[PDB]
Amino acid sequence: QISVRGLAGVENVTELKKNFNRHLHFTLVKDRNVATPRDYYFALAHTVRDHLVGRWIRTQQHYYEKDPKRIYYLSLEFYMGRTLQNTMVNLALENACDEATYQLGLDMEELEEIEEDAGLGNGGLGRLAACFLDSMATLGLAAYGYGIRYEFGIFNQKICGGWQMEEADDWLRYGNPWEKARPEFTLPVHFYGRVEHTSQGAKWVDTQVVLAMPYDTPVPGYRNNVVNTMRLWSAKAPNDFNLGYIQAVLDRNLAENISRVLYPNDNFFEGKELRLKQEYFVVAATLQDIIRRFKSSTNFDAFPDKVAIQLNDTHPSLAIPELMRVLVDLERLDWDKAWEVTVKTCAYTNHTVLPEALERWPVHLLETLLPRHLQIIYEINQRFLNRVAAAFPGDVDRLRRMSLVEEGAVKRINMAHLCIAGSHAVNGVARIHSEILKKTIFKDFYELEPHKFQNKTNGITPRRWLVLCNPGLAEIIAERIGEEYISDLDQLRKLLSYVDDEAFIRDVAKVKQENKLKFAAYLEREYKVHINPNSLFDVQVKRIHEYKRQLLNCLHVITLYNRIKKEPNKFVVPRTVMIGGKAAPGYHMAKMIIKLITAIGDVVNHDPVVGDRLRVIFLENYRVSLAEKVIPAADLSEQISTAGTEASGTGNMKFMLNGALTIGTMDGANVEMAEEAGEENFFIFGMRVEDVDRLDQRGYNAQEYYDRIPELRQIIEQLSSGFFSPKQPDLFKDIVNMLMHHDRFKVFADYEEYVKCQERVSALYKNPREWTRMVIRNIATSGKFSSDRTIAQYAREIWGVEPSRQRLPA
Amino acid sequence: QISVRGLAGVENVTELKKNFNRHLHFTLVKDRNVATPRDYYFALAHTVRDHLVGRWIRTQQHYYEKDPKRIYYLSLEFYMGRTLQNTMVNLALENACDEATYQLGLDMEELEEIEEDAGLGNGGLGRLAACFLDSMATLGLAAYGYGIRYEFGIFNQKICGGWQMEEADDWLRYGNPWEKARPEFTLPVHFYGRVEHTSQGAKWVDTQVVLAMPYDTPVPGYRNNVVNTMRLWSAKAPNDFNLGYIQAVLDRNLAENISRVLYPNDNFFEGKELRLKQEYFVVAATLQDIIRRFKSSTNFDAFPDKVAIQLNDTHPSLAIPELMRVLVDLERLDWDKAWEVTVKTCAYTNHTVLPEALERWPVHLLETLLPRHLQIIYEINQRFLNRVAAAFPGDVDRLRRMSLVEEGAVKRINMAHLCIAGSHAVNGVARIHSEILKKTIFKDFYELEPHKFQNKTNGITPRRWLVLCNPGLAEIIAERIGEEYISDLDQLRKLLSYVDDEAFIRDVAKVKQENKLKFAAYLEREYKVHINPNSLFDVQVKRIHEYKRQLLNCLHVITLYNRIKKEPNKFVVPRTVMIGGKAAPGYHMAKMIIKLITAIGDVVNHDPVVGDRLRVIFLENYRVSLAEKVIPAADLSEQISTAGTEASGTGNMKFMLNGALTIGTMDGANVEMAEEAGEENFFIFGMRVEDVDRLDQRGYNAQEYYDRIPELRQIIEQLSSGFFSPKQPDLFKDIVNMLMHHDRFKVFADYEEYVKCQERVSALYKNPREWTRMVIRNIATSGKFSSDRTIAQYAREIWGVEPSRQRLPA
Ligand SMILES: COC(=O)C(=O)N[C@@H]1O[C@H](CO)[C@@H](O)[C@H](O)[C@H]1O
Ligand SMILES: COC(=O)C(=O)N[C@@H]1O[C@H](CO)[C@@H](O)[C@H](O)[C@H]1O
Ligand SMILES: *Cc1c(COP(=O)(O)O)cnc(C)c1O
Ligand SMILES: *Cc1c(COP(=O)(O)O)cnc(C)c1O
């Protein structure tokens, strides 16, 4: 149908059809008379998968022959989403498969909706890992993603009575056609035990053993015939485990629980033993695999020349002491040489500055679970502090501030300090974030080793986030500038010469309208909810958290509602406000915010006077597959975190690339986005980081804003009086109390400027032509935010490898 | 190579080779450079599996079109063993696959050894179910085997320090290529809750739900293109299960534990809650599936005409009250009509008379777990006893003897009584066993309803137990009488006309020698143990149990050893005594018997004076695959259970068909085997059932035998003095105490006659020609013991269906 979706050759369509029927028969063991839609989905999945194998086998054989430096990206999260369409896009098989299934009397889009999301992540951090794998494959890097194969990913969110209900994400129920179990590479992981000091070296003995079984999933590059690997470990008990009889067998579950479920927290540290076990589990299995592959290429001096380990935050920080343990205890290298190798091999990426999100493990936990690692950590700390003492003689407070060991009620290990000490590079994920790291939380470290600190602004893959989810936009763009931009997003700048092109302006606006119509229909299909496609689609989708300030958005919504009730027959630009995102199960305030949102909708959506001028919808179960649907349909992107709290943000980039204008604070990547597009083409408002600091020094007093802003006072009084909760008048008392007495994120402080800015948005929307021209200016300057640019910088500035755009023989 | 293995056509060999390479590439994602033997095994398995699908799909379509009466065999055990070779045999692909793999540079036999046994059974009862499935498919019956897909089957037995060690049988570790998950047919099973009595009928409410997910495995008939199904249920927790968050997800294990492991008991009842849950789990899921299929053919009067349910012992006895529950509570049929349908639908097979093996569930357990079923059972009992009271007025003791409810310390439900009352047919598994049922334990029931009692002597499938495990013997036989006997075993009688044929006599003897050489080599390969292939192979393989009397065998072995030590330079026929079998983990005496056996071997195998004249080997981890190796190599089959205890026995039939002579008591099927072959061609000894009864009436006094038999006294003194356990003089004190004071199985009573009989065996072995002629007479008369004969009788006399030998279009 459309150009960017590839060719539908006669030979290929014929081949696809026969292989489809072959799998339906031999693989699914079914006939066209009893086959269900799910059966057809699997037949198609296996058919597409077949096209990957040849390339997958030769890519790996290629790396063996050339032996390039290997990149290992360690993460406890890989938010992959669905794999079928992405695979077709990267293999240029979309139109062929669409035609083939069409001829078989099937609708491919219907089949794609059957695939379960691989939701092995919470949000931004996990999705970044997924985008990175795509880019590393597209740039021809010998990269491997290593993680855990959770039996249950992020929970499926259900809304009952306006409240969030959690249900298990049994994503493997019907099977996973993309993965390939590799039991032959199963490795042992040790826990507990004790340390024994012998004549020659220490020994970790009397440990409990848990097996790590790997499952490999192919990661295809964009049309370059490269297929890398994502290896996820699954926990298995040894067969002699606990070996009355029956109980011993049933207790195998204890060991296998390690890979059972993903901790559902976004930007929040929960110091539970099971989580620590998961972190060591992935690190121990991965490092053995890395060393095994290295030897199969004694001379560990060349280890850093053949290996690069990237730590996605501190979750896999134990890789540092584990590498030391192996090199020192097992390989018998002297400490100094081992440390040199470790530092040159490891690099650390920080993803937040919120104190509650930093990992600080209790010493008593490490002491019992990983006794040898604790000893190695104390030794690392000892030698590191000796270096600090030599550089800053007499500065005793600096010593206690930089220590990896934190004193107090209970001693803890600051994992971030461990990562900085044992890594040759430390980076933030957006310019402002990286600067904050050097100026605040990591200031002492920056002063000791300035060369270690870098910035690597985040990005998103234009394959999944443009071509896959918005083919209509990808097509009108390709029509003007070709298809080269898909793997060289900077070329979108050429669109700047079409900002005055009446034809282009019309096409851009038409694509958006079509996306909105499609999404508007979807809402009624799977969720039975009516919305006016002519209204401005105002959306804020991301995990629910106080720092992201969904509450500020709520305040604006209520303001709009009160204004309409005050002057009913006054014209206002129609809006459909959409808010979606999951709240961590144990995050009470976050769950209350969800209830507030649905409560507001209950009132606003049923008020006769409002009509179709204002609608408030809460998008249930926001996940990757849902993002691919709502983002292309958005007009306004809400990125309103308090300045200095959102390290980078990536959802913001997805909206910019898909034709939505942005209203937001100068926080995270928003700053660079506005810089690229021009501040006049962005809706910036609120306090800057400096303004927040000034307020804190003076003391934030929410009462002041309440006393001086009549409209704000009214909203708070409505909340307190039960206006939004008739049967439960004090239902939102906790929210009001927090806002009024202990709001760490200063919601009230940005209220006035936010509302004013929103009026400017409605003003521009009333002028279709000018709204679209500003949109074009945003799309045209979103090139910098491609994860291909991000990965190329990591490759050259951190890993020491050169990216390649060369195709491999298919 | 050999005739009976089929043709190796050029076209087929070429096709097999290409499909083998296809699966290695696309299915296993590997190349010939990194493929391991396990990889090659799977490539072959998938290749053979492909040949089954077409036939499997059309067989099921066939049953849908013709709608014949369906046979449902319910069992908690299906001891299948390996599937690859069996599939090739039934599809006549063995030589083709052998040639194809040969050309690819691979040894098929080596690949077959890689497959894990599907050990979902304990012994005889579970293997009978497996043989039955094979025969039902070969006889063209629309049969379905229903059971549980245990994650862990019978434990793998390891021998350490002469003691049995148990280790988990993780048979699904590398995957199961034969099964096909059918999540689309997942069904709910209810537990706990309470009964609510409403205006119209009772309702079972507030129950906990566990999902039953089916996995289908194909069951090919012998060269008739019929492929039936074995459906095994797997337990799955619902997604809203227990829905802090993490714990709720981890607790899903509680529900899924139902299908986690097989209870490892042979002829022993263990009243644990988990076992009861397994029994109801299989019954509830299966019955819903049966009824669903029935409706997809309201008129339950025709239910018995379209459905037959065979209960393999009482394990699935809850099918009776569950069927009543569904018909009465859900379908709204009146009790009397529902009962009529239930009785006409169900049939029960008893497999033992040992009191400790009978199921008697505590009322308090059923009361809590299945409240509605308990009520239905009380009602059934009430109406049944009313019938008894009317037939035998005033006989109050008969009423208490026949009640389904047993009074006493704790009230229990006698499941056997439940089965007899709710079944239209009850059968024993050997003529003598069925007679004992009518004369003793079920006497009262037989007097009330004589027409219900039948006999169906057991059998074994000649496919796995002759053609598959002993191709050499199958070939020399086919050379003389053709291949028709493989599916019409009675034709072996034609071999009687070759008993004087010098050529045949030589071939029979040659095949046995080759089998012994192969097995003798195997022992050194995987177990490093030397044995003299020229000796008589004396073997007893079966589960370890006191009633099977492995101890009597031990006494004979020690006798032989003492005699040699007494007259060292006297000639004796060399023997290799092999004993193997697993002991239930909680069966202490059984574990002590294993230790005694290895202890005897430790002494006998290292005595210089004995030389290679006597060897005692304990065959580790006896299972189906091992049986296929040792049985064809045996000369003497030990079937020495105390008369009246072995219901039938089936191992005895396997040995008879494979050229071994039998030494045994007139117990179980041994009686019919001797009757078929002629008592002069069997080595019978010991007390008959009548003799055992006389002894019990008089009182068994073991001391008497000890006082009057010098050789026996010596053995007991050696055991007591520590002769076989130097470091632990009283190690076998429990064994001696049991033998001397509380031996329920009268080991001593048959000692003298057993030893005398064994001398007659050694005498015949010294005459090769006559030994072989007697062997021929046994093989020639083993036809009656084919499970095809057994199934044909069940079909005509119980299920009301006619077996068919007609091929289906392939
Ligand atoms: C440990 O931090 C987190 O939980 C987390 O998800 N952080 C997130 O990581 C993303 C990728 O760098 C950033 O864009 C987000 O701003 C940051 O909050
Ligand atoms: C519940 O009984 C058992 O545990 C069991 O395995 N019984 C066995 O069943 C076999 C098949 O009929 C018979 O041949 C054996 O003699 C009987 O002991
Ligand atoms: C892109 C993405 C995120 C990150 O969004 P931010 O607004 O940067 O927090 C979270 N969840 C999903 C499903 C995403 O696709
Ligand atoms: C045939 C068989 C049995 C039954 O043997 P009996 O001697 O009748 O108890 C038990 N186990 C296995 C593995 C078998 O093949």
What does this structure look like?
The PDB classes it as transferase. Keywords: glycogenolysis, type 2 diabetes, transferase. The assembly is dimeric. The structure is a homodimer. By secondary structure, chain A is α/β, with parallel strands linked by helices. Chain A folds into 2 domains: about 1-460 and about 785-810, Glycogen Phosphorylase B (Rossmann fold); about 460-785, Glycogen Phosphorylase B (Rossmann fold, 3-Layer(aba) Sandwich). Helix content of chain A is about 45%, strand content about 15%. Chain A has 33 helices and 25 strands. In chain A, the strands form 6 sheets. In chain A, strands 1, 4, 7, 8, 11, 12, 13, 14, 18 and 19 form a 10-stranded mixed beta sheet that branches. Chains A and B meet through helix 2, strand 6, strand 7 and helix 7 of A and helix 2, strand 6, strand 7 and helix 7 of B. One N-[methoxy(oxo)acetyl]-beta-D-glucopyranosylamine binds near residues 266, 646, 648, 650 and 668 of chain B.
